[PDB]
Each structure stands twice: as structure tokens, then as C-alpha cells.
Amino acid sequence: NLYFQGHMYVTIVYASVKTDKTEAFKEATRMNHEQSIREPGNMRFDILQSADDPTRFVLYEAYKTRKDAAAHKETAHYLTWRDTVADWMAEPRKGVIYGGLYPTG
Template sequence: NVRFDILQSADDPANFVFYEAYKTQQDAAAHKETAHYLAWRDTVADWMVEPRKGVAYQGLYPIVNN
């Protein structure tokens, strides 16, 4: 994990975005297999107004060397 941010909407304080940056797609996939991720996922499932969804973006800056 290169970066992890939690963002709160300025217009709707009940709306949050969790942002994680990884060097590779394989790194992101491996993270989703870890015990701490699986525990977090199961813990927060009932907190969500709707099911979580992943949105993939391509990082342009900062440039991360592999």
C-alpha cells in the first residue's frame, strides 16, 4: 500500500470515500486476501448504506517507481 486516505464529503458528512493506492494490481489483489482486510470488510459491511464498490483509477502523479 503506497497511500491510504479517508475522505469525507463537504456536502454530506455521512458520505465517505476510502482511497488506497498500490504499485500494481497484483498488490491490490494480494491485500484483499490478508486477514486484516477480510476482518475489516466483514466488520464494516453493516455500516454501509449500500454495498461497497471498487472504482479503479490509474495513478498519474506522483510517479511511483516499481
């Protein structure tokens, strides 16, 4: 077992957006970000746009605990976002799970 103990629960979410919905996607994701940073135990909810390709986005969603992260998918703003952007995805989003080694807190 080569896994280290996590100190933050992180999901890097990769989104490829339809070419004519990039602004629409940013606006919808702004709303998600604004509410998500207020969730208990949220440590980051950074919204990123690829320098090389504006249709490529990342949501970097970091929480103190896994159960804090789990609660996110229960929120109205998540559910709203998910339904809103569904038709603007050029392909399925992928979420990759990480454990935070540093900072330790």
C-alpha cells in the first residue's frame, strides 16, 4: 500500500464545452462557485479555463473532508448547475479524485 493519508479531499473536474457555449458555461459555473465557496469545509472551488483552449475548463473542488465533498452534490446550486450545463457539454465531464498531502492543516 503506497497511498498516503489524505488531509483534503479533492476532485479535479474536467469539462469540454461546446464551442458556442463557453460564455454560457462560465456564467452558470460562476453561480456554482459563489455558492460552493460558502459550503461548510470548502477549501477551494477554483474555476479554470485552459490557456491553450477556451473550450476546456477545470473545476478544482477541494474540501476539508470527504463528507463535506459528498454534501456538495446535494445542494440546489449543484443540481441547478448540472441540469443547466448538461446540453452544453461537448463530451461527458470527468472527475478525478485525489488526496491532499500538503498543506496538512
